């Protein structure tokens, strides 16, 4: 049913339950504005199973420019928007069936239709008919999902209602967590303690069960609800009347679905419940509301927007705010300054804002069809006030309309802006889907279409993926394993053929710094990353920071995201700040001590690795390097000593010959891992064995495990065996038929096959936690005498050829299914999780975990885009450093954080002189120049004198240190060394501290220039 190659990512995100729910779901959507659209599309490409656009107006010059896929054709004919756009919208996702409809909205309309769809998404109505609408579908039995939202210019509102009760299935969507019980009390309320330095991160109320509890059988199986006490502590309630804490014990997290309670949308007027995205001014949401009220009454009253530069329009409007604001509830102190910005902007068109916010809104609606997470309750207001709030006091002639496309964003921004937008050269670094939006977002405002200076440069190496369609909505399926950035500029000059790109294939990374050298940089004026790894994000900033640039960052995973802004001199730049590592899995609870089925998929990742990577490699490396069996022989004989030699050995003693050895290898492999390994480890320590203190040596957080008896007829080691087979003949180039996995012939192959016995040894363990993978063991004279012994039986046999010296080589593909990768994870992961008394994971989180694949959603990417995009307005517009806000986000909640970003940091080093990240020194001179000439010319430019000097690593000079005291005779050239391409050379200093004896305090890099 779930098309995993095309919906994997967000089925890690909502869950298959939710694909099935929005499967034989119905939503009506209408308005087919910008925001509509947007709305559209992010349902098409979430797979709804069915969508019915509506809209009765007719293409339009000033729908163009908010709208990517109309054109001046469908103008020219007179065609409805929906007609025409409806052909392209089902490009994006054959799997839905979209219909159009254009029947006219009105008081005599009747709503009876409207039964068929479970959630109704309104955009672009007049006020009372929204509220006659919402009335009939709160109405229904089940009451029909309503959404409404609006965009006036800068401003936007969203309303959400699903009748006066709805049942949220999941809350917030994470994993429930699992947490080790070091002790419980008994006592009314007993407490438990929680494993030291684990805390539980849980919130008083929760509900939690447990098992595995020594002591206390009877709360294994449990629910109780928590308060929380400490980190580590909190009580659950009595548990005088019980038996005393042994050991052991996990309380595990409990979901609960709960009811949320809307309200009617005309009620909802006097009490609006509004979320907030900004703390710092929660009563500005309010006026938000109230300004938008008075808009809809001034279109009830005139029929019409208010029109730009129009005082008496303005008049009007605050009259009217005033009057409503007596009705409210709080009756909120009416702000003439959004009262005035909306009367100068109400007819225009802001398409980033319109974009987030139909992703906010898609996500809503996806909300409403599955109760996968909190829904908004009720109201959002977003804005972009900052963006006019820089111009001061501009005029009209800014945002007259021109007759041109851009028409709608020149009635919000003003033309100069548009000019500057359009002369913008902007280099984008990786075009996912975040880059897709990007694009489409730079197409409709027009950033770079000027033939005099606008250009966008973007790059990407990797190709198109099926997996990929789901987000990057610009590629088709015929489009797979094309280059990205071409097919999505070519996409983006069907958006706009005025646009100007060049795309490339390339990765941005040190070794291509050549092509992007610094004065590549220098030509552009923003940068904006839609990377995926922090490493690239990192090396980036560096070059930022290099040549002084603008730059924007965001990262999205799931319902989470984020977006950043760094502004020279104004911002802290992302290597500034720092963040412990993603934690390593101890090598003793990896090997032999897990704990989680994350360690068993992890096990079962790495021993894949190994013995379909690795080894084959080293294999077949050893071979390239010495020629034939009979020269490693004579070598041995002659005392030569090889470094992995005798693995290499053992491998040739282990090549199947034919299909049938393949899956004998497999079976004894098998026994190995799952029968011996527990045998051996149980050897080593019983379970009465005990520590030092007395206690049990098997306790939380190790686990004992039991060997596994082997059985065909189980089809977890059917899958098992059967990948297994598969991998070693593709590895030993042996052929084979899918009847050859047939349990028919499998079981006529072990009717044959003998299992030699286990038999246990002596190993040494490396069971403390600090331990980590040591060197090679020395392998015995004896082990090495069994390798020569094997080795002249393979000669003897003639297993010396190259076909015997070369194996095949593979990669871990997740992808593709066929390969068995997947497959064969899964099956080893889940019986490793069988031996340790762990239960088993399903296939695809098994992908998602192995993979390390992020869920990703395309609303989230909307959303994020959609606020880059507001950035760069805003940087582009120069403004001051107030007007930049860093941003977080959660659509679970759903949630929204707006916040001042990091202002940058000045330290001084002496007489008050300080300094930032940004700042580089710069000095000119000559060869004769010395470098006690250097540091009297710094103790004159800069009143301070260097007390060291280095160069990278060549360590220059400082007072202390003998023989380099004397180097101030010498001149820079043919002291430091430079490389004569360059007129100059880079080098770091610091001064003594104030206080003698402290660490010299490190000033700016500083480049000397030769001439
Ligand atoms: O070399 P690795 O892939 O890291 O795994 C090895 C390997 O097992 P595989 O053969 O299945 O890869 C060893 O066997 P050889 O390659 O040397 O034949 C085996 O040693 P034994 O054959 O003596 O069991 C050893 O087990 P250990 O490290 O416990 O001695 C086991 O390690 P892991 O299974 O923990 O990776
Ligand atoms: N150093 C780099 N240079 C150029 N492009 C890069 C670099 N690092 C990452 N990218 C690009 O960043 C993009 C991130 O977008 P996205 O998450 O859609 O990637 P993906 O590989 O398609 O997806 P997934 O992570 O789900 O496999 C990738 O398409 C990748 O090509």
Known sequence: EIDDALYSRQRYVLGDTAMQKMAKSHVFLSGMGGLGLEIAKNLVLAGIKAVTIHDTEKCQAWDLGTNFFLSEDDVVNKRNRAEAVLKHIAELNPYVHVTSSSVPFNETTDLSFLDKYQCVVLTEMKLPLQKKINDFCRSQCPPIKFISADVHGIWSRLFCDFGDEFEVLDTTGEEPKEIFI??????????????????????????????????????????????????????????????????????????????????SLERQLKHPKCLIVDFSNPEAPLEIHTAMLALDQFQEKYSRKPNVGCQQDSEELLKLATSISETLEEKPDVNADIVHWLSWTAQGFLSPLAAAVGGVASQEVLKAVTGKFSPLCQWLYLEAADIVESLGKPECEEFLPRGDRYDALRACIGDTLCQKLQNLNIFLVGCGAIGCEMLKNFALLGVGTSKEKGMITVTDPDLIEKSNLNRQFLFRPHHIQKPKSYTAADATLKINSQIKIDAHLNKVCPTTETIYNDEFYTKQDVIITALDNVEARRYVDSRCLANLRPLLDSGTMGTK????????????????????????????????????????????????????????????????????????????????????????????????????????????????????????????????????????????????????????????????????????????????????????????????????????????????????????????????????????????????????????????????????????????????????????????????????????????????????????????????????????????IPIVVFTETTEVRKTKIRNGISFTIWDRWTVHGKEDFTLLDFINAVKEKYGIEPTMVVQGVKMLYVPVMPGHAKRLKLTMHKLVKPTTEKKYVDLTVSFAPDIDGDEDLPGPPVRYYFS
């Open 561 to 892: 995201g984020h977006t950043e802004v760094i502004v020279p001199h104004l911002t802290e730049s992302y290597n500034s700040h720092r963040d412990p590592p993603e934690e390593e899995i101890p090598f003793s609870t990896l090997k032999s001590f897990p704990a989680a089925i994350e360690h068993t998929i992890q096990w079962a990742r790495d021993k894949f690795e190994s013995s379909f990577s690795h080894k084959p490699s080293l294999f077949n490396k050893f071979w390239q390097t010495y020629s034939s069996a009979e020269e490693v022989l004579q070598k041995i004989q002659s005392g030569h000593s090889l470094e992995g030699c005798f693995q290499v050995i053992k491998l040739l003693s282990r090549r199947p010959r034919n299909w049938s050895q393949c899956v004998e290898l497999a079976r004894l492999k098998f026994e190995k891992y799952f029968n011996h390994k527990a045998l051996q480890l149980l050897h080593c320590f019983p379970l009465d064995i005990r520590l030092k203190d007395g206690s049990l040596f098997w306790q939380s957080p190790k686990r004992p495990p039991s060997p596994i008896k082997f059985d065909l007829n189980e089809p977890l080691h059917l899958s098992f065996l059967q990948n297994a087979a598969k991998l070693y003949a593709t590895v030993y180039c042996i052929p084979f038929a899918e009847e050859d996995l047939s349990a028919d012939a499998l079981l006529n192959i072990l009717s044959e096959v003998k299992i030699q016995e286990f038999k246990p040894s002596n190993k040494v363990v490396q069971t403390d936690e600090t331990a980590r993978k040591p060197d090679h063991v020395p392998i015995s004279s004896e082990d090495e005498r069994n390798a020569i012994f094997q080795l002249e039986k393979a000669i003897l046999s003639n297993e010396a050829t190259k076909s015997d010296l070369q194996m095949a080589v593979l990669s871990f593909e997740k992808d593709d299914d066929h390969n068995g990768h997947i497959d064969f994870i899964t099956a080893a992961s889940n019986l490793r999780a069988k031996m340790y008394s762990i239960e088993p994971a399903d296939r695809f989180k098994t992908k998602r975990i192995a993979g390390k694949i992020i869920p990703a959603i395309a609303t989230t990417t909307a959303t994020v885009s959609g606020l880059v995009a507001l950035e760069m307005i805003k940087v582009t517009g120069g403004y001051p450093f107030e007007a930049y806000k860093n941003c977080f986000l959660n659509l679970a």
């Open 182 to 263: 070091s002790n419980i009390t008994q006592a009314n309320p007993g407490i438990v303690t929680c494993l030291e330095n684990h805390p539980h991160k849980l919130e008083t109320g929760q509900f939690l069960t447990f098992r595995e509890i020594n002591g206390m059988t009877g709360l294994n199986g449990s629910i109780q609800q928590i308060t929380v006490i400490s980190p580590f502590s909190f009580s659950i309630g009595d548990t005088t009347e019980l038996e005393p804490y042994l050991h052991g014990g996990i309380a595990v997290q409990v979901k609960t679905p709960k009811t949320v309670f809307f309200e």
